[PDB]
Design an enzyme around this catalytic site. Structure first.
Site, short mmCIF file in Angstrom:
data_model
loop_
_atom_site.label_atom_id
_atom_site.label_comp_id
_atom_site.label_asym_id
_atom_site.label_seq_id
_atom_site.Cartn_x
_atom_site.Cartn_y
_atom_site.Cartn_z
CG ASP I 147 48.29 52.08 28.21
OD1 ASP I 147 47.84 51.05 28.78
OD2 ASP I 147 47.92 53.25 28.49
CG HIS I 749 37.98 35.65 46.87
ND1 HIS I 749 37.50 34.37 46.65
CD2 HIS I 749 37.49 36.41 45.86
CE1 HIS I 749 36.75 34.37 45.56
NE2 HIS I 749 36.72 35.59 45.06
#
Ligand SMILES: [Zn+2]
Ligand SMILES: [Zn+2]
Ligand SMILES: [Zn+2]
Lengths: 271, 165, 65, 98, 85, 196, 114, 136, 783, 43
Positions: I147, I749
Site C-alpha cells: 500500500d 483489557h
C-alpha cells in the site's frame, strides 16, 4: 451446412450479432473472442502534428482524444503496416493523412465534431479512413469546443494497428458470452442464503434449454458445447467482418506457426 | 488459584488452593507471619526481592517479570534471550538499570559509552582521567572504519605454507 | 472535462451521445434513467460514463483570452 | 421530555473532508480518519482557472466524475462540480495473485 | 609470544559459519585477480563458485587463527577443520 | 485508494482479454483482493459499491448520506427488481480460458480516488556522485542525487548477522574513507604530509 | 519510464526465433516448445485440440511471467511418434474447423434480415 | 505380480453428509461374516449411495512404482474392472487394539477407509499398491 | 550518532514495492533503470574477458552494460563520452564497472529495521516497470505490504562482501527465526486462503487442469500421479496433486481435536513420506507455526530446498485458485432473519440485567466486594454484563454463518480476520473505552447534551448496540469516535518510547559475543554466562518436544520403561528380539537393565524438581520424533519380524553416545563438569526415548537402523551448537525489542476476566528496565 | 483548499483525545495521522 462448428443466428443488426455457436470445443470459442477483442487490425490516428491550439484543452489531450475516434477500416487489409512500407516515415500505401481546421467563428459556441476531418492523401480508391458517424444529427463524436478567436489546426496520420498495441485500435466494444444456463455442468457453485433458485435470476438463454430435473443424477461425462455469444461492433468494420476476420486472424497466426515449424525442419537437416 | 500437584496414584491431579493478592509491599515483615508459606510468597516488586532474598533470587524475579510482560500479550521469546538480558543487569553486583545510570559509565570504553547518551561530558572526564581505550568494542571500531572483532572478524586469517603441494 | 469517447470499461462510442442526452432531458422532459436507454446504453459500464459525467468545459471557455 | 433545543441534522458534526465519505456510520472509526487525510491528496480540478495561474506544480484529472454515491453535504461543498476521482468498475476477487 | 601448542583441543574442530564464509570470501578475492587455482575447473568461472570447489577438495592454503579472551590463540588449518553446517 | 482508507498500489495491468468478464461482456477496470476486507473492517466500501450499481442501472443518484433510513435490505430489494443478485454477486468467466468461475464474484461501480505518489517520483538510485562540504559524506535528498542513510539501527541488524567486512565497506569504500599521517609518540595528525 | 514498448507483445527482436523446440530431459519421448510473442489465445487452443488425439500422453502450457509474451507447451506422446507431428496434426484440425466455421457463418449471415 | 486381496458383500447402514455435497461417509457392515464393519468415503455425486443398500467390495491391486498413469483407452487394452466404482489408495496403519480382530486404515488421496475383520492376516500388506472396486 | 554510527552511503536505491506470485523467494525485482545505475567493480580475469569486453562495448544504455573502466595507472575511462569508447582493449588486472545483472548479491532492507530479518540478501532479477518486486512470503520478516511502502537496497563492491552477503544474510538461511524457535516466513493471504480450498474433500480436480499444474511445478518428476478416483471418471483429489510440491521423506503429525485417524470433518494433519493422507491444510500446517511444514522441511531437507518449496506451493495454489475464483460481498455479513431477531433479544435481556443492577445499587442493597468501592463493583459489574452480552451475540452470528460464506472461509483459513470481526460486522459492535474506563462525563453529570444528568445506562455511557451493517447512530458514532481516536494517539506518541527502549537494549547488550571458549562475555572480558543460554545452543536449531518421563501414572511409567528379564510376566516377548528367550534369567544383564531403570527413575524425580509445573513440552535440540520416523521409513521395517539387537547394543550404546555430544571441548575437572551438566536436560529426553522397552516395541529398530539413529543424533546435535562469533548481544536486544514494538492499544483489557489490575505492556516494561523505585502496581501474593 | 482554511492549531492533562464537548464544533474524524495527531483540529 458443413461438418464442423454450427453457427445459428437468431437476431442480428447493423451493430449486433446474436448467435448460438453450436458444436465447438471451449478452448476454441474463447480464443475466438480474445483474438476478436484485440488481434484484428484497423486504422486510427496515430500521429498528430499541431500547428496552433488556443483552445481550453491541452495539445496531448486532444491528441489522445483523436486516436479513439472510429475511422473506417474496410479495405484495411490492403494497407501495408507502417513498420514495413519501405517509404521513410509515413506514406499513402501505409497511411491515410487527415487534416483538421476549426476556428471560433461566431460569438456563440463553436463545436468541433469529427465531420470536420479532411482526408488529404490519395485513397488510391479504397474504402478506408472515412471517420464514422452514427449520430442522427449527422455529427461524428465530439473533439473540442470553441468560443471566440480560438484556432485549432491539426494534421493526423492514421496507421494500421492492433488493439493489443493500444485499445484505440479495438473494433470490439463489448462481447457477450455464456455457456450452460441451468448449470448442469456444475461449473459454478451458487452462493446463497435460502433457495439458490430464487436467489439468482435465469438468463434469457434458459428458454433455449431444459430444466436439470432434480430427480435425475448428476451427469459426469459432459463437455461444454453450445455457446450463447453476442458481438457488438464499434463500427470501423461491420459486425459480420469482426467475427469473420476474427476467425481468419486466428487461422492466420495458427498457420504462421504450422509454417514456421516447417521452416525449421529444412533448415538444420538440409543446409 | 489452581495448581498441578503429584497425586499418590501418579497423575498430575489439579488441586485447587486459596491465595491472597495484595496492594503494596513489605516482604520484610510479611513472610515472618504464622499460617503462610515462606518458601512460596511472591512479590512482583523484584526490587524488594533483591534486598530480602539476595541477588540470585533477584535474577529470577527480574526474569519472571520481563517474561510475564512478553507472554502477557500472546508473544513468545526463547529463554536464552531475556536470560542474557536479565544476567547483564546482575553480574555488576546489584540491579543495574538499562539507562546511563545502570550500564555504561562503568570504566568500559570512553568512545563507546560516549556513543549512547551524554556525549561531551563523557569525553571531557575521559580526557581528564587519561583514559586508555581498549579498542575491542563494536562501536569503537565503527568510529574508526576498521573491521570489528565480530563474527566474520572474530579471528585472523593466515598462509600456512607446506603447500607447496 | 469533456465527454470521453468510448466507455473505459467496454468501449462503445459515447462521445457523440452527450448532446442527444441533454436534449432528451430539457426538451423531451425525461429522467436521466430513460434518457440513457433511448441512447443505446444498455450496459451499465457505459451508463456511468454519461450519468456521472461533468462538463467542466462550459466553465472553462468562460474565460477570455 | 423537557427539551429546549434540537439539532439541525447530525451529519453536521462532521468536517469538510469527512462529509465526502459515504456511510461513515458503517465504518470502523480510524478508517474515516484515513480517508480524511487522503481526500486531501486525491486529484482533480482544484480551480476552474488552472490554465491561467502560475503556481509551482499542480495536477489535473483528464476525466473527473461525480461519484454515484453522495452526501447531502457534498452539495454545499461543490464536490459534484469539482470531483477528484472516477466511478471505476471494481472487482473483488483473488484472480492470479498480483 | 605465548601460543597454544599444536594439540590441546580447547575449541571446536568444526568450522564456524563466520570462518567458512570469511575463508570462502578470501579465496574469492584471490581467484578474482588471475591468481592460480588449485582445482581443475569443471567448466565454472566465478571466483565464489570456484572457491567452493577448492573447499570440497580441501585444497585452500589458509590457517584460521582463533582468539581466546586472555590474549592467547589457536591455529587451525583448513585441512584440520571439519566443514559440516 | 477508495474513500474508506482502502489504500493500495497497482501491482499489475491486464488487457481486457486476460481479464475476468461477466456474461454481459463487462470487464472490471480494477481488482482488489477480498483479504483487505474483514481485518480492517470497512463495510461502507462494500455498501457504496452495492448502491452505486443500482444508481448506474436505474440512472439515478446515490444517497450515501450518513444517518438515514437507508437499508442494505431496501437496496437489494431494488437491484433484485433490476434482474440481479441482490447482494452484488455476478457469475464471471476466467480470461485465459473462458471457463465459468466456480465462485461468484462481488463486482460493481465504486468511486476511486487517484492519490498523488507515483513510482517515478519516488524512484531513486545512486552509485557515487555529489559529496558534502564538511563531512565528505554523500549529500542528502534525491533531488540532488544523494545516497541513502545507513542509520545505527541498520548497523545493528548487520552486527547481528556477524557480517563484518560488509559493514567496514558501508563505511569506507562507499561514503567516507580518508587517509592521514600520524606520530610515533604523541599520536595526533600534526604530521606535515609533504608527499612526493 | 521503464515501461517496455507495446509492439513487444507481437514482434520479434534480434536472433529471436519464433519457436525454440527442446528435448525434455526428464521423461522420454517428450518435448517442451517455447512460443515467442504469444499467449492464451494460442497456448490454450493448441492444448485442448491436442488432448483430443488419443495418441498423446501429456500436454499442457504455462505462461512464465505475465510481463513477457511467451508460453511453453510440453508434449509427450505414444512411443514411435514425433510430437512435432502431433503438433502438426493438431494445428490443421483447428484450421479445418475455422475454415469451416467461417463458411458456416457466411451461409447464415447472408440469410438474416437487417 | 497381480491378483485380488479381499472380497465381501456389505450392507449400507448410515450415509453421513458431514457438511459436504461431493462426498459421503458411509457406514456399512458385513453379510454372514457377523463381526465385520466398514467405514468408507464415497463421492456420491458420481456413484450415488442411498441407505439400505448392498455393495460388492473388492480390494485387489491388479493392472518404477507409478509409471505415469496413461489415459484410459480401455477399449483396446484389457481392464481390471467390471465394477461401477473404483478408487486407488494408500494404507497408513493397521490398528490392533485387543482383538481377536483387526482394522485397516486406507486413504484414497483424501477419502478414508476403516475396515474390520480377522481373516486377512495374509491378505493386506503395509504397502502402497491398493485399489477398491464397487458394484451393484 | 549521525555521522559515524550511521552514514549516508553510495551504491544504494529505493522504490515502491509490489508482490510477485511468480517470483522466487530469495529473489527481488530490480527495475532496469536502477540496474542500469548501480555498478559493481569487477576485475578482468581470463575467465570473464569475453563477457566483459562485450559489456564494455555494449554501452551504458543496453542493460547488460557498463560505465567506466579502471586501468593500471589508475585512470577512469568514462564510457558515456571518451573517443575510444567503442575501441578499448581490456587486458587482465583492469576493472570494468558493469551494471547489476541477474542473480547477484543485494542487501535489501525496510525501515524500521528492528531485526536481522529486516536486512536480508536477495537475488537480482532485472525487470520492466519501476517497482522492487518480491515474493509474497518474504512479506512477514520485513512487515511490508504494498500500500505504498518503499524499500531499500545496497550493492556490495568487494568479493569478500559478496560472499558475506550470500553466506549469512541470504534469505533462505533466515527462514527459521532465532528469536522464537520457529519459521518466520509462511504461506500468506491468497495462497493460504486457497491452499485450504484445494485441500477440502469435496475439491476434485480433473485431467485438463491436473496436467497443467503438474507442469506448473518446476523439477516435477514428470510422472502423473495415479488418480485417487479412477471410477466412471478419472479425477484426482485436491490434496492429491499439492502433494507433488512436497518433497519426499517428509513426515508430519497433528491431531487437532476430534481426530480419530478418520476425522469426522478432516481435523488434524497426517503427512506420510511425500504425500498427505488426511486433514485440511491451512495456517497450523502451511503457516509459519512451530510444528508447521516449513520448520519440518527446513531442518530436514535444507534451506535451499525449503526456499524452492515456497515457490512450488504458491505456483500451484495460485493457479488452481486463479481458475476457481474467490470473493467477498455484503451477503457475507448478513445473518438469518430468525437470527437477527434473536440477537436483538440477546441484547435486550442484557440491557435489562443492567437496569436491575442499577435499580438495585440505587436502593442501596448492592454490597461492595471486599477491597473495592460500591461504585467500583457496580462499574466492573455492568462492563462485564455488556461484554458477555456481545460475545454471546457474536458467537451467535458465528454459528449462523454458512460454510459457503467467504468471510468465514478466510478465518477458517486464517488468511485475515478473526471472531471479533464477524461480531462487529453482523451482530453488535459493543462497548467503547478510554483510559480503561467506559465512556466518561465530559459534560457535567452527562455524556452528551442529548442526555439527562446522572445516567449510567448502556446507551448513555457508550455501548453501541447496532452493528457495522445496520449502521451506528448519531451518539454511537461519536463515541466510537472518541474510542478509535485513542488508537492513533498511542501509535503516534507511545512508539517514541517503544523505539527508545529498543535503542537502549541494543546499546546495553551490543558487544556481548560468544567466544572460542564458549562463555558469553563483553568488551572487558567479563563473563555474563559461562555457557551461552546455559547450554551453548543456537536458538535456531531447537524445538519443543515433550519429555514423556513426567506426566504419567506412578504405575503406567513402570509399564513403559521396566524390563524384568528374570520375571516371566515383565520380560520382553521372544517376538521382540532375536535373543528373546535364552535371555530370560541371566543376572549379568539384569545388572545393566537395572542400571538403566535406576537412572530413569532417578530422572523422573529430577525433572519433577526442575519443572515443578508438570509441563513436559520444552525447547530442546535435535527432534527425535522425526529421527525415528526417518528410520522406520528409510529401512522399511515390518512390525512382525523380531529385532537383531543385544541388550548391550542398546543400553550400552546410548551410554556411549552421551560421551561424545561435546559442547565444551576442554579436558579438565570443572570443564568436563559443566559439560556434563549443560547436557543433563537433553539426555533425560535421550534416555527416555532410547529406553530398551521402547527401541524394541514401540519402534522396532534393527541393528543397522540403530547405529544410524545414534550416529545421526550425534551429528545433528553438533550442528545445534552455538558458533563462536555469534553476537548474541544485539540478537537478544532485538529479539526483545520487536515483540515490544507489538504492544499498543490494549494493553491491557483484554478479552478474558477483564481488568488486570496490575501494570502491564510497555508501561511495565519501562519500569522493569529503569529499575523503577516507584511502581504503579506493587503486589504481594501469599500462599 | 477548503479543508486547510478551517485548521485549528495547538501549542506543545490529555489534550489529544476527542472530548465530549467537541460535539458539533470540531469534527471527530478529521485529523492528521501521526506526528502531531490530535493537537490539530478541523472545524
Ligand atoms: Zn508508406
Ligand atoms: Zn461501457
Ligand atoms: Zn608528534
Amino acid at each position: 451446412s458443413e461438418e464442423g462448428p454450427q453457427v445459428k443466428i437468431r437476431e442480428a443488426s447493423k451493430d449486433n450479432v446474436d448467435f448460438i455457436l453450436s458444436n465447438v470445443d471451449l478452448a476454441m470459442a474463447n480464443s475466438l473472442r480474445r483474438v476478436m477483442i484485440a488481434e484484428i487490425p484497423t486504422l486510427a490516428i496515430d500521429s498528430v502534428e499541431v500547428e496552433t491550439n488556443t483552445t481550453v484543452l491541452a495539445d496531448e489531450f486532444i491528441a489522445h482524444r483523436l486516436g479513439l475516434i472510429p475511422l473506417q477500416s474496410m479495405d484495411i487489409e490492403q494497407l501495408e503496416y507502417s513498420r514495413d512500407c519501405f517509404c521513410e516515415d509515413h506514406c499513402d500505401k501505409c497511411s491515410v493523412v487527415l487534416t483538421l481546421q476549426a476556428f471560433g467563428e461566431s460569438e456563440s459556441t463553436t463545436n468541433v465534431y469529427s465531420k470536420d476531418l479532411v482526408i488529404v492523401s490519395n485513397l488510391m480508391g479504397r474504402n478506408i479512413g472515412h471517420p464514422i458517424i452514427q449520430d442522427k444529427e449527422g455529427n461524428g463524436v465530439l473533439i473540442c469546443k470553441l468560443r471566440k478567436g480560438q484556432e485549432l489546426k491539426l494534421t493526423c496520420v492514421a496507421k494500421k494497428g492492433i488493439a493489443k498495441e493500444h485499445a484505440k485500435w479495438g473494433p470490439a466494444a463489448a462481447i457477450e458470452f455464456e455457456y450452460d444456463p441451468w448449470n448442469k455442468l456444475k461449473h459454478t457453485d451458487y452462493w446463497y442464503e435460502q433457495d439458490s433458485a430464487k436467489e439468482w435470476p435465469q438468463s434469457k438463454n434458459c428458454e433455449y434449454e431444459d430444466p436439470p430435473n432434480e430427480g435425475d443424477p448428476f451427469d459426469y461425462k459432459a463437455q461444454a458445447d453450445t455457446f450463447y455469444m453476442n458481438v457488438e461492433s464499434v463500427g470501423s468494420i461491420p459486425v459480420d467482418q469482426v467475427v469473420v476476420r476474427g476467425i481468419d486472424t486466428l487461422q492466420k497466426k495458427v498457420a504462421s506457426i504450422l509454417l514456421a515449424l516447417t521452416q525449421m525442419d529444412q533448415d538444420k537437416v538440409n543446409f | 488459584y489452581d495448581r498441578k500437584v503429584p497425586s499418590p496414584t501418579g497423575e498430575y491431579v489439579k488441586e485447587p488452593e486459596w491465595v491472597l493478592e495484595t496492594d503494596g509491599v513489605n516482604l520484610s515483615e510479611v513472610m515472618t507471619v504464622p499460617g503462610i508459606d515462606p518458601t512460596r510468597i511472591y512479590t512482583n516488586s523484584f526490587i524488594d526481592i533483591m534486598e530480602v532474598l539476595g541477588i540470585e533470587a533477584g535474577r529470577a524475579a527480574l526474569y519472571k517479570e520481563v517474561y510475564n510482560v512478553i507472554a502477557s500479550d500472546g508473544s513468545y521469546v526463547n529463554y536464552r534471550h531475556m536470560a542474557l538480558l536479565v544476567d547483564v543487569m546482575t553480574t555488576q553486583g546489584g540491579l543495574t538499570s538499562v539507562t546511563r545510570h545502570g550500564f555504561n559509565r562503568s570504566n568500559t570504553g570512553a568512545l563507546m559509552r560516549c556513543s549512547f547518551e551524554e556525549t561531551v561530558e563523557i569525553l571531557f572526564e575521559a580526557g581528564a582521567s587519561a583514559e586508555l581505550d581498549d579498542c575491542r568494542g563494536v562501536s569503537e571500531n565503527v568510529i574508526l572504519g576498521q573491521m570489528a572483532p565480530i563474527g566474520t572478524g572474530a579471528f585472523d586469517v593466515m598462509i600456512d605454507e607446506e603447500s607447496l603441494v | 472535462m469533456i465527454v470521453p469517447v468510448r466507455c473505459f470499461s467496454c468501449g462503445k462510442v459515447v462521445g457523440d451521445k452527450w448532446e442527444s442526452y441533454l436534449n432528451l432531458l430539457q426538451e423531451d422532459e425525461l429522467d436521466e434513467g430513460t434518457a440513457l436507454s433511448r441512447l443505446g446504453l444498455k450496459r451499465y459500464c457505459c451508463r456511468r460514463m454519461i450519468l456521472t459525467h461533468v462538463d467542466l468545459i462550459e466553465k472553462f471557455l468562460r474565460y477570455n483570452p | 421530555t423537557t427539551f429546549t433545543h434540537c439539532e439541525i441534522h447530525p451529519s453536521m458534526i462532521l468536517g469538510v473532508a469527512a462529509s465526502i465519505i459515504p456511510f461513515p456510520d458503517h465504518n470502523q472509526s480510524p478508517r474515516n480518519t484515513y480517508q480524511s487525510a487522503m481526500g486531501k491528496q486525491a486529484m482533480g480540478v482544484f480551480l476552474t482557472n488552472y490554465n491561467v495561474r502560475m503556481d509551482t506544480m499542480a495536477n489535473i484529472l483528464y476525466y473527473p466524475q461525480k461519484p454515484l454515491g453522495t452526501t447531502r453535504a457534498m452539495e454545499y461543498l461543490k464536490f459534484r462540480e469539482l470531483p477528484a476521482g472516477q466511478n471505476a468498475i471494481v472487482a473483488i476477487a483473488c484472480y492470479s495473485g498480483y | 609470544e605465548k601460543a597454544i601448542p599444536k594439540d590441546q583441543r580447547a575449541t571446536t574442530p568444526y568450522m564456524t559459519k563466520y570462518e567458512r564464509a570469511r575463508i570462502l570470501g578470501t579465496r574469492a578475492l584471490q581467484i578474482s585477480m588471475n591468481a592460480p587455482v588449485f582445482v581443475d575447473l569443471e567448466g565454472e568461472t566465478d571466483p565464489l563458485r570456484i572457491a567452493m570447489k577448492e573447499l570440497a577438495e580441501k585444497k585452500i592454503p589458509l590457517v584460521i587463527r582463533r582468539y581466546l579472551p586472555d590474549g592467547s590463540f589457536e591455529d587451525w588449518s583448513v585441512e584440520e577443520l571439519i566443514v559440516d553446517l | 485508494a477508495s474513500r474508506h482508507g482502502q489504500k493500495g498500489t497497482i501491482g499489475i495491468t491486464y488487457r481486457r482479454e486476460d481479464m475476468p468478464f461477466t456474461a454481459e461482456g463487462i470487464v472490471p477496470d480494477l481488482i482488489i483482493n477480498p483479504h483487505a476486507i474483514p481485518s480492517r473492517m470497512t463495510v461502507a466500501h462494500l455498501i457504496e459499491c452495492l448502491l452505486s450499481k443500482v444508481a448506474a442501472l436505474s440512472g439515478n443518484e446515490g444517497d450515501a448520506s450518513p444517518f438515514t433510513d437507508i437499508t442494505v435490505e431496501g437496496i437489494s430489494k431494488l437491484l433484485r427488481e433490476h434482474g440481479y443478485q441482490s447482494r452484488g454477486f455476478e457469475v464471471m468467466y476466467n480470461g485465459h480460458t473462458g471457463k465459468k468461475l466456480m465462485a461468484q464474484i462481488f463486482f460493481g461501480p465504486t468511486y476511486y480516488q487517484r492519490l498523488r505518489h507515483m513510482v517515478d517520483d519516488k524512484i531513486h538510485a545512486r552509485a557515487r556522485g555529489p559529496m558534502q562540504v564538511l563531512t565528505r559524506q554523500p549529500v542528502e535528498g534525491r533531488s540532488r542525487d544523494g545516497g541513502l542513510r545507513f542509520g545505527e539501527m541498520e548497523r545493528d541488524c548487520m552486527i547481528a548477522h556477524g557480517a563484518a567486512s560488509f559493514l567496514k565497506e558501508r563505511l569506507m569504500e562507499a561514503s567516507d574513507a580518508f587517509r592521514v599521517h600520524i606520530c610515533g609518540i604523541c599520536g595526533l595528525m600534526t604530521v606535515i604530509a609533504k608527499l612526493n | 519510464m521503464n515501461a517496455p514498448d507495446r509492439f513487444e507483445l507481437f514482434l520479434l527482436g534480434e536472433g529471436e526465433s519464433k519457436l525454440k523446440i527442446d528435448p525434455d530431459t526428464k521423461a522420454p519421448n517428450a518435448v517442451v516448445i517455447t512460443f515467442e510473442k504469444e499467449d492464451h489465445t494460442l497456448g490454450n487452443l493448441i492444448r485442448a485440440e491436442l488432448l483430443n488425439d488419443r495418441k498423446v500422453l501429456f500436454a499442457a502450457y504455462k505462461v512464465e511471467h505475465p510481463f513477457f509474451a511467451r508460453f511453453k507447451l510440453r508434449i509427450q506422446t505414444t512411443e514411435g511418434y514425433d510430437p512435432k507431428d502431433a503438433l502438426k496434426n493438431a494445428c490443421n484440425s483447428i484450421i479445418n474447423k475455422l475454415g469451416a466455421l467461417k463458411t458456416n457463418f457466411e451461409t447464415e449471415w447472408n440469410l438474416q434480415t437487417l | 505380480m497381480s491378483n485380488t486381496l479381499f472380497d465381501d458383500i456389505f450392507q449400507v447402514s448410515e450415509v453421513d453428509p458431514g457438511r459436504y455435497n461431493k462426498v459421503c461417509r458411509i457406514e456399512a457392515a458385513s453379510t454372514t461374516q457377523d463381526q465385520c464393519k466398514l467405514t468408507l468415503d464415497i463421492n456420491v455425486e458420481l456413484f450415488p449411495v442411498a441407505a439400505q443398500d448392498s455393495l460388492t467390495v473388492t480390494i485387489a491391486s491388479s493392472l518404477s512404482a507409478t509409471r505415469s498413469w496413461r489415459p484410459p483407452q480401455a477399449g483396446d487394452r484389457s481392464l481390471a474392472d467390471d465394477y461401477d466404482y473404483v478408487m486407488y489408495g494408500t494404507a497408513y496403519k493397521f490398528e490392533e487394539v485387543s482383538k481377536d480382530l483387526i482394522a485397516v486404515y486406507y486413504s484414497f488421496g483424501g477419502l478414508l477407509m476403516r475396515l474390520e475383520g480377522n481373516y486377512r492376516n495374509l491378505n493386506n500388506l503395509k504397502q502402497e499398491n491398493a485399489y477398491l472396486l464397487i458394484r451393484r | 550518532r549521525g555521522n559515524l554510527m550511521g552514514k549516508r552511503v553510495d551504491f544504494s536505491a529505493r522504490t515502491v514495492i509490489s508482490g510477485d506470485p511468480n517470483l522466487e523467494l530469495d529473489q527481488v525485482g530490480v527495475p532496469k533503470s536502477i540496474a542500469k545505475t548501480l555498478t559493481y567493480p569487477e576485475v578482468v580475469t581470463p575467465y570473464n574477458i569475453d563477457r566483459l569486453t562485450q559489456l564494455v562495448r555494449n554501452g551504458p544504455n543496453e542493460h547488460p552494460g557498463a560505465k567506466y573502466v579502471i586501468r593500471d595507472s589508475g585512470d577512469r575511462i568514462d564510457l558515456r563520452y571518451s573517443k575510444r569508447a567503442g575501441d578499448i582493449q581490456l587486458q587482465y588486472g583492469w576493472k570494468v564497472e558493469r551494471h547489476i545483472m541477474d542473480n547477484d548479491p543485494v542487501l535489501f532492507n525496510r525501515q524500521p529495521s528492528l531485526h536481522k530479518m529486516s536486512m536480508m540478501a536477495h537475488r537480482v532479477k532485472v525487470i520492466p516497470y519501476s517497482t522492487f518486486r518480491l515474493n509474497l512470503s518474504v512479506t512477514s520478516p520485513y512487515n511490508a505490504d504494498f500500500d505504498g511502502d518503499e524499500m531499500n537496497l545496497h550493492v556490495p563492491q568487494s568479493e569478500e562482501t559478496r560472499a558475506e552477503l550470500s553466506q549469512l544474510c541470504a534469505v533462505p538461511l533466515q527462514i527459521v527465526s532465532p528469536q522464537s524457535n520457529k519459521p518466520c516466513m509462511g504461506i500468506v493471504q491468497d495462497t493460504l486462503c486457497g491452499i485450504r480450498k484445494l485441500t477440502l474433500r469435496d475439491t476434485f480436480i480433473e485431467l485438463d487442469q491436473v496436467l497443467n499444474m503438474l507442469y506448473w511445478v518446476p523439477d516435477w518428476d514428470g510422472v502423473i500421479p495415479t488418480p485417487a478416483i479412477i471410477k466412471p471418471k478419472p479425477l484426482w483429489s485436491g490434496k492429491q496433486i499439492l502433494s507433488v510440491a512436497i518433497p519426499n521423506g517428509i513426515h508430519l503429525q497433528r491431531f487437532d481435536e476430534g481426530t480419530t485417524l478418520l476425522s469426522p470433518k478432516d481435523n488434524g494433519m497426517l503427512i506420510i513420506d511425500g504425500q498427505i493422507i488426511f486433514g485440511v491444510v491451512e495456517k497450523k500446517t502451511v503457516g509459519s507455526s512451530n510444528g508447521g511444514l516449513i520448520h519440518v522441511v527446513t531442518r530436514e531437507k535444507g534451506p535451499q530446498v525449503c526456499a524452492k518449496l515456497f515457490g512450488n506451493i504458491q505456483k500451484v495454489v495460485n493457479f488452481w485458485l486463479l481458475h476457481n475464483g474467490f470473493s467477498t460481498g455484503i451477503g457475507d455479513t448478513i445473518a438469518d432473519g430468525p437470527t437477527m431477531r434473536e440477537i436483538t433479544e440477546t441484547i435486550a435481556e442484557a440491557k435489562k440485567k443492567v437496569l436491575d443492577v442499577t435499580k438495585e445499587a440505587q436502593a442501596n442493597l448492592l454490597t461492595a466486594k471486599h477491597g473495592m468501592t460500591l461504585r467500583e463493583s457496580f462499574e466492573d459489574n455492568v462492563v462485564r454484563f455488556l461484554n458477555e452480552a456481545r460475545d454471546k451475540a457474536g458467537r451467535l452470528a458465528e454459528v449462523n454463518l454458512k460454510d459457503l460464506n467467504n468471510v468465514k472461509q478466510m478465518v477458517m483459513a486464517g488468511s485475515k480476520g478473526s471472531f471479533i470481526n464477524i461480531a462487529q460486522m453482523s451482530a453488535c459492535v459493543g462497548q467503547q473505552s478510554v483510559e480503561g474506563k467506559r465512556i466518561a462525563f465530559g459534560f457535567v453529570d452527562r455524556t452528551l447534551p442529548h442526555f439527562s444528568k446522572d445516567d449510567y445506562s448502556p446507551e448513555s455511557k457508550g455501548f453501541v448496540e447496532n452493528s457495522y451493517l445496520r449502521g451506528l447512530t448519531p451518539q454511537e458514532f461519536f463515541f466510537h469516535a472518541m474510542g478509535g481516536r485513542e488508537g492513533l494517539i498511542d501509535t503516534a506518541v507511545k512508539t517514541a518510547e517503544t523505539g527508545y527502549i529498543q535503542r537502549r537494549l541494543v546499546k546495553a547488550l551490543e558487544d556481548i559475543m560468544v567466544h572460542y571458549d564458549n562463555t558469553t562475555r563483553n568488551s572487558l572480558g567479563n563473563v555474563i554466562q559461562f555457557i551461552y543460554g546455559e547450554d551453548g545452543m543456537d536458538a535456531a536449531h531447537i524445538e519443543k518436544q515433550s519429555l514423556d518421563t513426567i506426566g504419567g501414572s506412578d504405575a503406567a511409567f513402570e509399564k513403559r520403561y521396566r524390563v524384568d528379564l528374570l520375571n516371566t510376566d515383565h520380560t520382553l516377548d521372544p517376538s521382540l528380539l532375536e535373543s528373546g528367550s535364552e535371555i530370560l534369567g541371566d543376572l549379568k544383564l539384569q545388572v545393566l537393565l537395572d542400571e538403566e531403570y535406576k537412572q530413569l527413575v532417578k530422572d523422573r524425580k529430577f525433572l519433577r524438581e526442575v519443572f515443578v509445573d508438570g509441563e513436559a513440552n520444552w525447547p530442546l535440540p535435535v527432534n527425535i520424533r522425526r529421527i525415528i520416523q526417518n528410520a522406520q521409513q528409510t529401512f522399511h521395517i515390518d512390525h512382525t519380524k523380531p529385532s537383531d539387537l543385544t541388550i548391550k547394543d542398546i543400553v550400552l550404546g546410548v551410554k556411549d553416545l552421551q560421551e561424545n555430544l561435546l559442547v565444551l571441548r576442554g579436558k579438565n575437572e570443572i570443564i568436563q563438569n559443566a559439560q556434563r551438566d549443560a547436557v543433563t536436560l537433553f539426555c533425560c529426553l535421550l534416555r527416555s526415548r532410547l529406553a530398551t522397552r521402547r527401541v524394541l516395541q514401540e519402534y522396532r529398530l534393527t541393528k543397522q537402523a540403530f547405529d544410524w539413529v545414534l550416529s545421526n543424533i550425534e551429528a545433528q546435535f553438533l550442528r545445534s551448537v552455538v558458533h563462536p562469533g555469534e553476537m548474541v548481544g544485539v540478537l537478544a536486544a532485538q529479539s526483545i525489542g520487536e515483540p515490544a514494538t507489538q504492544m499498543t492499544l490494549n494493553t491491557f483489557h483484554f478479552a478474558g476476566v477483564a481488568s488486570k489490575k496490575v501494570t502491564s505492556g510497555v508501561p511495565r516494561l519501562k519500569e522493569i528496565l529503569n529499575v523503577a523505585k516507584n511502581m504503579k502496581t506493587p503486589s504481594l501474593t501469599v500462599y | 483548499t477548503l479543508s486547510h482554511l478551517r485548521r485549528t492549531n495547538t501549542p506543545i492533562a490529555k489534550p489529544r483525545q476527542l472530548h465530549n464537548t467537541h460535539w458539533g464544533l470540531v469534527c471527530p474524524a478529521e485529523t492528521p495521522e501521526g506526528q502531531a495527531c490530535g493537537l490539530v483540529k478541523n472545524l
